[PDB]
Amino acid sequence: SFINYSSREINCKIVYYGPGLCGKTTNLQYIYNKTAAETKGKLISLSTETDRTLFFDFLPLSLGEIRGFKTRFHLYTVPGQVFYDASRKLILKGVDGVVFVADSQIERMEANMESLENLRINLAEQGYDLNKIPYVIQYNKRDLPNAVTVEEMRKALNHRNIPEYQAVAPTGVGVFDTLKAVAKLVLTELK
Amino acid sequence: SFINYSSREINCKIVYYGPGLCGKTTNLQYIYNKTAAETKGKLISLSTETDRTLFFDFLPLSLGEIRGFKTRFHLYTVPGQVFYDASRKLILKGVDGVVFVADSQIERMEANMESLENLRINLAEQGYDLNKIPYVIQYNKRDLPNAVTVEEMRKALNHRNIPEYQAVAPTGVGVFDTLKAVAKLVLTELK
Numbered sequence: 001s002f003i004n005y006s007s008r009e010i011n012c013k014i015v016y017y018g019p020g021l022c023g024k025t026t027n028l029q030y031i032y033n034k035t036a037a038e039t040k041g042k043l044i045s046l047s048t049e050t051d052r053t054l055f056f057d058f059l060p061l062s063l064g065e066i067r068g069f070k071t072r073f074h075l076y077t078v079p080g081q082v083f084y085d086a087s088r089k090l091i092l093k094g095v096d097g098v099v100f101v102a103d104s105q106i107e108r109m110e111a112n113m114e115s116l117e118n119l120r121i122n123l124a125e126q127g128y129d130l131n132k133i134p135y136v137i138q139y140n141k142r143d144l145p146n147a148v149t150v151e152e153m154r155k156a157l158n159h160r161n162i163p164e165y166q167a168v169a170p171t172g173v174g175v176f177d178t179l180k181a182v183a184k185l186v187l188t189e190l191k
Numbered sequence: 192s193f194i195n196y197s198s199r200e201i202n203c204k205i206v207y208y209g210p211g212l213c214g215k216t217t218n219l220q221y222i223y224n225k226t227a228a229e230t231k232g233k234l235i236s237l238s239t240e241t242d243r244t245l246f247f248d249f250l251p252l253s254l255g256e257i258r259g260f261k262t263r264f265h266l267y268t269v270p271g272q273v274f275y276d277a278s279r280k281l282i283l284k285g286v287d288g289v290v291f292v293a294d295s296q297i298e299r300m301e302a303n304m305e306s307l308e309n310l311r312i313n314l315a316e317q318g319y320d321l322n323k324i325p326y327v328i329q330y331n332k333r334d335l336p337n338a339v340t341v342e343e344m345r346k347a348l349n350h351r352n353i354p355e356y357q358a359v360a361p362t363g364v365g366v367f368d369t370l371k372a373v374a375k376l377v378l379t380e381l382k
Protein backbone atom coordinates (compact mmCIF):
# COMPACT_ATOMS: atom_id res chain seq x y z
CA SER A 1 0.00 0.00 0.00
CA PHE A 2 2.96 2.49 0.45
CA ILE A 3 5.77 2.73 -2.13
CA ASN A 4 9.14 4.06 -0.99
CA TYR A 5 10.54 5.18 -4.43
CA SER A 6 13.95 6.17 -2.93
CA SER A 7 14.74 3.00 -0.86
CA ARG A 8 13.00 0.91 -3.65
CA GLU A 9 10.56 -0.85 -1.25
CA ILE A 10 6.85 -1.73 -1.45
CA ASN A 11 5.48 -1.45 2.13
CA CYS A 12 2.49 -3.62 2.81
CA LYS A 13 0.29 -3.71 5.91
CA ILE A 14 -1.00 -6.98 7.37
CA VAL A 15 -3.62 -6.54 10.10
CA TYR A 16 -4.25 -9.26 12.74
CA TYR A 17 -7.88 -8.88 13.78
CA GLY A 18 -10.10 -10.71 16.24
CA PRO A 19 -11.77 -10.46 19.69
CA GLY A 20 -9.84 -9.31 22.76
CA LEU A 21 -7.46 -12.00 24.17
CA CYS A 22 -7.80 -14.32 21.09
CA GLY A 23 -3.99 -14.57 20.49
CA LYS A 24 -3.05 -11.62 18.21
CA THR A 25 -0.11 -10.41 20.40
CA THR A 26 1.02 -14.07 20.70
CA ASN A 27 1.09 -14.48 16.85
CA LEU A 28 3.08 -11.19 16.39
CA GLN A 29 5.52 -12.01 19.27
CA TYR A 30 6.13 -15.56 17.98
CA ILE A 31 6.76 -14.26 14.39
CA TYR A 32 9.00 -11.46 15.77
CA ASN A 33 11.08 -13.87 17.95
CA LYS A 34 11.74 -16.21 14.95
CA THR A 35 12.55 -13.41 12.42
CA ALA A 36 16.31 -12.85 11.69
CA ALA A 37 17.52 -9.71 13.60
CA GLU A 38 19.10 -8.09 10.48
CA THR A 39 15.76 -8.26 8.54
CA LYS A 40 13.44 -6.61 11.11
CA GLY A 41 12.77 -3.33 12.92
CA LYS A 42 11.79 -2.99 16.60
CA LEU A 43 8.63 -4.58 18.13
CA ILE A 44 6.64 -1.46 19.03
CA SER A 45 3.90 -1.31 21.64
CA LEU A 46 1.91 1.93 21.51
CA SER A 47 -0.54 2.99 24.22
CA THR A 48 -2.87 5.95 25.00
CA GLU A 49 -5.72 6.33 27.59
CA THR A 50 -8.23 5.29 24.84
CA ASP A 51 -6.34 2.74 22.66
CA ARG A 52 -3.43 0.24 22.14
CA THR A 53 -1.36 -0.88 19.11
CA LEU A 54 1.36 -3.52 18.55
CA PHE A 55 3.43 -3.55 15.37
CA PHE A 56 6.74 -4.24 13.61
CA ASP A 57 8.13 -4.52 10.08
CA PHE A 58 10.47 -6.94 8.32
CA LEU A 59 12.07 -7.34 4.88
CA PRO A 60 12.36 -11.13 4.16
CA LEU A 61 15.66 -11.94 2.30
CA SER A 62 14.14 -15.05 0.60
CA LEU A 63 11.74 -12.88 -1.49
CA GLY A 64 12.47 -11.70 -5.02
CA GLU A 65 11.54 -8.33 -6.52
CA ILE A 66 8.33 -6.86 -8.00
CA ARG A 67 9.46 -4.53 -10.85
CA GLY A 68 12.84 -3.92 -9.11
CA PHE A 69 11.18 -3.30 -5.70
CA LYS A 70 11.63 -5.36 -2.50
CA THR A 71 8.50 -6.03 -0.36
CA ARG A 72 8.57 -4.96 3.31
CA PHE A 73 5.86 -6.44 5.58
CA HIS A 74 4.28 -4.41 8.43
CA LEU A 75 2.30 -6.52 10.97
CA TYR A 76 -0.28 -4.49 12.99
CA THR A 77 -2.82 -5.41 15.76
CA VAL A 78 -5.00 -3.77 18.44
CA PRO A 79 -4.12 -6.02 21.45
CA GLY A 80 -6.18 -6.79 24.60
CA GLN A 81 -9.61 -5.47 25.64
CA VAL A 82 -10.95 -2.73 23.28
CA PHE A 83 -12.87 0.21 24.82
CA TYR A 84 -13.25 2.29 21.61
CA ASP A 85 -14.31 0.96 18.15
CA ALA A 86 -12.32 3.92 16.63
CA SER A 87 -9.02 2.02 17.32
CA ARG A 88 -10.26 -1.00 15.25
CA LYS A 89 -11.30 1.49 12.48
CA LEU A 90 -7.84 3.23 12.67
CA ILE A 91 -5.81 -0.08 12.61
CA LEU A 92 -7.40 -0.93 9.18
CA LYS A 93 -6.24 2.30 7.45
CA GLY A 94 -4.17 1.31 4.39
CA VAL A 95 -4.56 -2.44 5.04
CA ASP A 96 -3.17 -4.79 2.29
CA GLY A 97 -4.04 -8.13 4.00
CA VAL A 98 -6.03 -9.36 7.04
CA VAL A 99 -5.56 -12.34 9.38
CA PHE A 100 -8.71 -12.99 11.41
CA VAL A 101 -7.68 -14.79 14.64
CA ALA A 102 -10.61 -16.73 16.10
CA ASP A 103 -10.53 -17.90 19.74
CA SER A 104 -11.59 -21.59 19.60
CA GLN A 105 -13.16 -21.55 23.12
CA ILE A 106 -16.94 -22.17 23.22
CA GLU A 107 -17.42 -19.05 25.46
CA ARG A 108 -15.67 -16.85 22.82
CA MET A 109 -17.76 -17.92 19.74
CA GLU A 110 -20.22 -14.99 20.13
CA ALA A 111 -17.16 -12.67 20.42
CA ASN A 112 -15.59 -14.22 17.23
CA MET A 113 -18.83 -13.61 15.25
CA GLU A 114 -19.22 -10.04 16.64
CA SER A 115 -15.56 -9.25 15.72
CA LEU A 116 -15.79 -10.84 12.22
CA GLU A 117 -18.93 -8.74 11.44
CA ASN A 118 -17.15 -5.65 12.98
CA LEU A 119 -14.20 -6.32 10.58
CA ARG A 120 -16.62 -6.46 7.60
CA ILE A 121 -18.36 -3.20 8.73
CA ASN A 122 -15.09 -1.30 9.42
CA LEU A 123 -13.56 -2.43 6.07
CA ALA A 124 -16.71 -1.36 4.06
CA GLU A 125 -16.63 2.15 5.68
CA GLN A 126 -13.13 2.58 4.14
CA GLY A 127 -14.09 1.20 0.69
CA TYR A 128 -12.59 -2.30 1.23
CA ASP A 129 -14.57 -5.53 0.62
CA LEU A 130 -13.72 -8.44 3.01
CA ASN A 131 -14.68 -10.89 0.17
CA LYS A 132 -12.08 -9.31 -2.23
CA ILE A 133 -9.06 -8.36 -0.02
CA PRO A 134 -6.22 -10.92 0.83
CA TYR A 135 -7.84 -12.53 3.87
CA VAL A 136 -7.06 -15.70 5.92
CA ILE A 137 -8.72 -17.11 9.09
CA GLN A 138 -6.83 -18.72 11.99
CA TYR A 139 -8.61 -21.04 14.48
CA ASN A 140 -6.41 -20.34 17.50
CA LYS A 141 -6.28 -22.08 20.94
CA ARG A 142 -6.64 -25.60 19.41
CA ASP A 143 -4.84 -26.98 22.56
CA LEU A 144 -7.68 -26.09 25.01
CA PRO A 145 -10.26 -28.69 26.20
CA ASN A 146 -13.17 -26.18 25.82
CA ALA A 147 -12.31 -25.71 22.06
CA VAL A 148 -15.12 -26.07 19.49
CA THR A 149 -14.49 -28.52 16.59
CA VAL A 150 -12.87 -27.26 13.34
CA GLU A 151 -16.18 -28.13 11.54
CA GLU A 152 -18.22 -25.90 13.97
CA MET A 153 -15.80 -22.99 13.53
CA ARG A 154 -15.79 -23.38 9.73
CA LYS A 155 -19.66 -23.36 9.74
CA ALA A 156 -19.84 -20.27 12.00
CA LEU A 157 -16.92 -18.18 10.63
CA ASN A 158 -15.85 -19.42 7.16
CA HIS A 159 -18.95 -19.54 4.85
CA ARG A 160 -16.85 -18.28 1.86
CA ASN A 161 -14.22 -21.13 2.27
CA ILE A 162 -11.17 -18.78 2.42
CA PRO A 163 -7.71 -20.15 3.63
CA GLU A 164 -7.95 -21.49 7.21
CA TYR A 165 -5.25 -22.54 9.67
CA GLN A 166 -5.40 -24.35 13.01
CA ALA A 167 -3.01 -22.84 15.54
CA VAL A 168 -1.61 -22.91 19.10
CA ALA A 169 0.04 -19.47 18.93
CA PRO A 170 2.25 -19.72 22.17
CA THR A 171 4.04 -22.81 20.74
CA GLY A 172 4.01 -21.32 17.22
CA VAL A 173 1.86 -24.11 15.72
CA GLY A 174 0.14 -22.74 12.56
CA VAL A 175 1.61 -19.20 13.09
CA PHE A 176 4.05 -19.08 10.12
CA ASP A 177 1.55 -21.03 7.90
CA THR A 178 -1.10 -18.29 8.53
CA LEU A 179 1.48 -15.51 7.79
CA LYS A 180 2.89 -17.19 4.62
CA ALA A 181 -0.69 -17.70 3.27
CA VAL A 182 -1.83 -14.03 3.69
CA ALA A 183 1.62 -12.69 2.48
CA LYS A 184 1.37 -14.85 -0.73
CA LEU A 185 -2.16 -13.45 -1.40
CA VAL A 186 -0.82 -9.87 -0.86
CA LEU A 187 2.14 -10.49 -3.26
CA THR A 188 -0.23 -11.84 -5.97
CA GLU A 189 -2.33 -8.60 -5.64
CA LEU A 190 0.91 -6.51 -5.89
CA LYS A 191 1.99 -8.46 -9.04
CA SER B 192 12.28 21.32 12.32
CA PHE B 193 9.41 20.01 10.03
CA ILE B 194 7.30 22.34 7.84
CA ASN B 195 3.83 21.13 6.83
CA TYR B 196 3.27 23.37 3.72
CA SER B 197 -0.30 22.05 3.20
CA SER B 198 -1.71 22.41 6.78
CA ARG B 199 0.43 25.64 7.16
CA GLU B 200 2.19 24.46 10.37
CA ILE B 201 5.80 24.62 11.59
CA ASN B 202 6.38 21.45 13.70
CA CYS B 203 9.03 21.76 16.34
CA LYS B 204 10.47 19.09 18.64
CA ILE B 205 11.20 19.81 22.31
CA VAL B 206 13.17 17.07 24.06
CA TYR B 207 13.05 16.66 27.89
CA TYR B 208 16.37 15.12 28.88
CA GLY B 209 17.86 14.08 32.22
CA PRO B 210 18.71 11.03 34.38
CA GLY B 211 16.19 8.24 34.98
CA LEU B 212 13.40 9.19 37.47
CA CYS B 213 14.31 12.95 37.49
CA GLY B 214 10.74 14.14 36.62
CA LYS B 215 10.50 14.17 32.79
CA THR B 216 7.21 12.14 32.63
CA THR B 217 5.84 14.37 35.44
CA ASN B 218 6.61 17.58 33.44
CA LEU B 219 4.97 16.16 30.23
CA GLN B 220 1.91 14.80 32.14
CA TYR B 221 1.41 18.11 34.03
CA ILE B 222 1.66 20.12 30.74
CA TYR B 223 -0.67 17.61 28.97
CA ASN B 224 -3.31 17.75 31.79
CA LYS B 225 -3.39 21.61 31.69
CA THR B 226 -3.51 21.90 27.85
CA ALA B 227 -6.98 22.60 26.29
CA ALA B 228 -8.38 19.34 24.75
CA GLU B 229 -9.13 20.96 21.32
CA THR B 230 -5.45 22.10 20.94
CA LYS B 231 -3.68 18.77 21.58
CA GLY B 232 -3.24 15.25 20.21
CA LYS B 233 -3.08 12.07 22.32
CA LEU B 234 -0.45 11.43 25.07
CA ILE B 235 1.47 8.50 23.50
CA SER B 236 3.54 5.97 25.41
CA LEU B 237 5.78 3.82 23.21
CA SER B 238 7.64 0.73 24.43
CA THR B 239 10.00 -1.94 22.99
CA GLU B 240 12.20 -4.60 24.77
CA THR B 241 15.17 -2.14 24.52
CA ASP B 242 13.63 1.36 24.93
CA ARG B 243 10.70 3.66 25.98
CA THR B 244 9.26 6.97 24.65
CA LEU B 245 6.58 9.41 25.87
CA PHE B 246 5.30 12.16 23.60
CA PHE B 247 2.44 14.42 22.46
CA ASP B 248 1.85 17.50 20.32
CA PHE B 249 -0.17 20.71 20.75
CA LEU B 250 -0.98 23.85 18.77
CA PRO B 251 -1.30 26.76 21.28
CA LEU B 252 -4.13 29.21 20.30
CA SER B 253 -2.43 32.15 22.13
CA LEU B 254 0.50 32.16 19.63
CA GLY B 255 0.66 34.30 16.51
CA GLU B 256 2.04 33.26 13.12
CA ILE B 257 5.54 33.06 11.58
CA ARG B 258 5.12 34.08 7.89
CA GLY B 259 1.48 32.83 7.89
CA PHE B 260 2.40 29.53 9.63
CA LYS B 261 1.18 28.32 13.06
CA THR B 262 3.74 26.61 15.35
CA ARG B 263 2.91 23.08 16.62
CA PHE B 264 4.97 21.85 19.58
CA HIS B 265 5.98 18.16 19.95
CA LEU B 266 7.21 17.25 23.49
CA TYR B 267 9.38 14.05 23.60
CA THR B 268 11.17 12.15 26.45
CA VAL B 269 12.79 8.75 27.17
CA PRO B 270 11.12 8.00 30.58
CA GLY B 271 12.35 5.76 33.44
CA GLN B 272 15.55 3.69 33.69
CA VAL B 273 17.58 3.63 30.42
CA PHE B 274 19.29 0.35 29.42
CA TYR B 275 20.59 1.46 25.98
CA ASP B 276 22.34 4.81 25.14
CA ALA B 277 20.94 4.38 21.55
CA SER B 278 17.46 5.50 22.81
CA ARG B 279 18.91 8.80 24.14
CA LYS B 280 20.71 9.22 20.73
CA LEU B 281 17.41 8.45 18.85
CA ILE B 282 15.22 10.82 20.99
CA LEU B 283 17.46 13.78 19.88
CA LYS B 284 16.91 13.22 16.10
CA GLY B 285 15.49 16.49 14.66
CA VAL B 286 15.47 18.27 18.03
CA ASP B 287 14.60 22.05 17.95
CA GLY B 288 14.88 22.69 21.74
CA VAL B 289 16.04 20.83 24.88
CA VAL B 290 14.89 20.98 28.52
CA PHE B 291 17.46 19.38 30.84
CA VAL B 292 15.62 18.19 33.98
CA ALA B 293 18.03 17.87 36.93
CA ASP B 294 17.06 15.81 39.99
CA SER B 295 17.91 18.06 43.01
CA GLN B 296 18.60 15.09 45.37
CA ILE B 297 22.21 14.85 46.63
CA GLU B 298 22.34 11.12 45.62
CA ARG B 299 21.39 12.05 41.99
CA MET B 300 24.06 14.79 41.40
CA GLU B 301 26.54 12.34 39.82
CA ALA B 302 23.66 11.09 37.57
CA ASN B 303 22.76 14.73 36.60
CA MET B 304 26.41 15.47 35.59
CA GLU B 305 26.73 12.13 33.68
CA SER B 306 23.41 12.84 31.82
CA LEU B 307 24.32 16.49 31.02
CA GLU B 308 27.69 15.37 29.53
CA ASN B 309 25.83 12.50 27.70
CA LEU B 310 23.45 15.16 26.22
CA ARG B 311 26.46 17.22 25.00
CA ILE B 312 28.12 14.08 23.47
CA ASN B 313 24.89 12.80 21.79
CA LEU B 314 24.07 16.29 20.37
CA ALA B 315 27.63 16.74 18.93
CA GLU B 316 27.43 13.32 17.15
CA GLN B 317 24.38 14.70 15.24
CA GLY B 318 26.00 18.09 14.43
CA TYR B 319 24.17 20.06 17.19
CA ASP B 320 26.05 22.28 19.69
CA LEU B 321 24.52 22.35 23.23
CA ASN B 322 25.98 25.91 23.66
CA LYS B 323 24.08 27.18 20.52
CA ILE B 324 20.72 25.29 20.49
CA PRO B 325 17.57 26.54 22.42
CA TYR B 326 18.34 24.96 25.78
CA VAL B 327 16.93 25.50 29.33
CA ILE B 328 17.75 23.74 32.65
CA GLN B 329 15.17 22.79 35.30
CA TYR B 330 16.22 22.10 38.94
CA ASN B 331 13.44 19.67 39.80
CA LYS B 332 12.43 18.15 43.20
CA ARG B 333 12.93 21.49 45.07
CA ASP B 334 10.39 20.21 47.71
CA LEU B 335 12.63 17.35 49.04
CA PRO B 336 14.69 17.61 52.27
CA ASN B 337 17.73 15.88 50.62
CA ALA B 338 17.81 18.63 47.86
CA VAL B 339 21.08 20.40 47.10
CA THR B 340 20.97 24.26 47.16
CA VAL B 341 20.21 26.20 43.92
CA GLU B 342 23.76 27.69 44.13
CA GLU B 343 25.35 24.13 44.23
CA MET B 344 23.26 23.01 41.25
CA ARG B 345 24.08 26.19 39.26
CA LYS B 346 27.84 25.64 39.97
CA ALA B 347 27.70 21.95 38.95
CA LEU B 348 25.28 22.09 35.97
CA ASN B 349 24.95 25.66 34.64
CA HIS B 350 28.48 27.07 33.92
CA ARG B 351 27.20 28.78 30.71
CA ASN B 352 24.41 30.68 32.61
CA ILE B 353 21.54 29.54 30.34
CA PRO B 354 17.84 29.95 31.50
CA GLU B 355 17.19 28.03 34.75
CA TYR B 356 13.96 27.22 36.59
CA GLN B 357 13.26 25.78 40.03
CA ALA B 358 10.45 23.24 39.93
CA VAL B 359 8.29 20.77 41.87
CA ALA B 360 6.91 18.98 38.77
CA PRO B 361 4.01 16.98 40.53
CA THR B 362 2.42 20.27 41.72
CA GLY B 363 3.34 22.03 38.45
CA VAL B 364 5.62 24.61 40.13
CA GLY B 365 8.08 25.91 37.49
CA VAL B 366 6.71 23.50 34.78
CA PHE B 367 5.02 26.05 32.46
CA ASP B 368 7.86 28.60 33.09
CA THR B 369 10.44 26.00 31.84
CA LEU B 370 8.26 25.20 28.77
CA LYS B 371 7.53 28.89 27.90
CA ALA B 372 11.30 29.69 28.16
CA VAL B 373 12.50 26.91 25.76
CA ALA B 374 9.50 27.53 23.37
CA LYS B 375 10.37 31.30 23.20
CA LEU B 376 14.01 30.42 22.34
CA VAL B 377 12.77 27.98 19.62
CA LEU B 378 10.41 30.66 18.16
CA THR B 379 13.29 33.22 18.00
CA GLU B 380 15.38 30.61 16.03
CA LEU B 381 12.35 30.02 13.68
CA LYS B 382 11.95 33.83 13.15
Ligand SMILES: Nc1nc2c(ncn2[C@@H]2O[C@H](COP(=O)(O)OP(=O)(O)O)[C@@H](O)[C@H]2O)c(=O)[nH]1
Pocket residue numbers: 018019020021022023024025026027078079080081140141142143144167168169170
Ligand atom coordinates in the same frame (compact mmCIF):
# COMPACT_ATOMS: atom_id res chain seq x y z
N1 LIG C 1 -4.04 -22.03 25.67
C1 LIG C 1 -3.76 -21.07 24.80
N2 LIG C 1 -3.60 -19.82 25.23
C2 LIG C 1 -3.38 -18.94 24.23
C3 LIG C 1 -3.28 -19.19 22.88
N3 LIG C 1 -3.04 -18.02 22.18
C4 LIG C 1 -3.00 -17.09 23.11
N4 LIG C 1 -3.20 -17.58 24.38
C5 LIG C 1 -3.23 -16.84 25.64
O1 LIG C 1 -4.37 -16.00 25.64
C6 LIG C 1 -4.06 -14.79 26.37
C7 LIG C 1 -4.38 -13.58 25.51
O2 LIG C 1 -3.64 -13.68 24.27
P1 LIG C 1 -3.04 -12.39 23.52
O3 LIG C 1 -2.11 -12.83 22.40
O4 LIG C 1 -2.42 -11.43 24.44
O5 LIG C 1 -4.36 -11.76 22.89
P2 LIG C 1 -4.74 -10.48 22.01
O6 LIG C 1 -5.55 -9.58 22.89
O7 LIG C 1 -5.50 -11.05 20.86
O8 LIG C 1 -3.45 -9.81 21.58
C8 LIG C 1 -2.61 -14.92 26.83
O9 LIG C 1 -2.55 -15.39 28.17
C9 LIG C 1 -2.03 -15.93 25.84
O10 LIG C 1 -0.89 -16.66 26.28
C10 LIG C 1 -3.43 -20.55 22.42
O11 LIG C 1 -3.31 -20.95 21.27
N5 LIG C 1 -3.69 -21.42 23.47
Ligand SMILES: Nc1nc2c(ncn2[C@@H]2O[C@H](COP(=O)(O)OP(=O)(O)O)[C@@H](O)[C@H]2O)c(=O)[nH]1
Pocket residue numbers: 209210211212213214215216217218269270271272331332333334335358359360361
Ligand atom coordinates in the same frame (compact mmCIF):
# COMPACT_ATOMS: atom_id res chain seq x y z
N1 LIG D 1 9.17 14.84 45.57
C1 LIG D 1 9.17 14.94 44.24
N2 LIG D 1 9.00 13.84 43.50
C2 LIG D 1 9.06 14.09 42.17
C3 LIG D 1 9.25 15.30 41.54
N3 LIG D 1 9.25 15.13 40.16
C4 LIG D 1 9.05 13.84 39.99
N4 LIG D 1 8.93 13.15 41.17
C5 LIG D 1 8.72 11.72 41.36
O1 LIG D 1 9.87 11.03 40.91
C6 LIG D 1 9.47 9.75 40.36
C7 LIG D 1 10.02 9.61 38.96
O2 LIG D 1 9.59 10.73 38.15
P1 LIG D 1 9.24 10.58 36.58
O3 LIG D 1 8.56 11.85 36.09
O4 LIG D 1 8.46 9.37 36.30
O5 LIG D 1 10.70 10.46 35.95
P2 LIG D 1 11.33 10.29 34.49
O6 LIG D 1 11.98 8.94 34.48
O7 LIG D 1 12.29 11.39 34.37
O8 LIG D 1 10.22 10.36 33.50
C8 LIG D 1 7.94 9.68 40.48
O9 LIG D 1 7.62 8.98 41.68
C9 LIG D 1 7.55 11.16 40.56
O10 LIG D 1 6.31 11.44 41.22
C10 LIG D 1 9.41 16.47 42.35
O11 LIG D 1 9.54 17.62 41.96
N5 LIG D 1 9.37 16.18 43.71
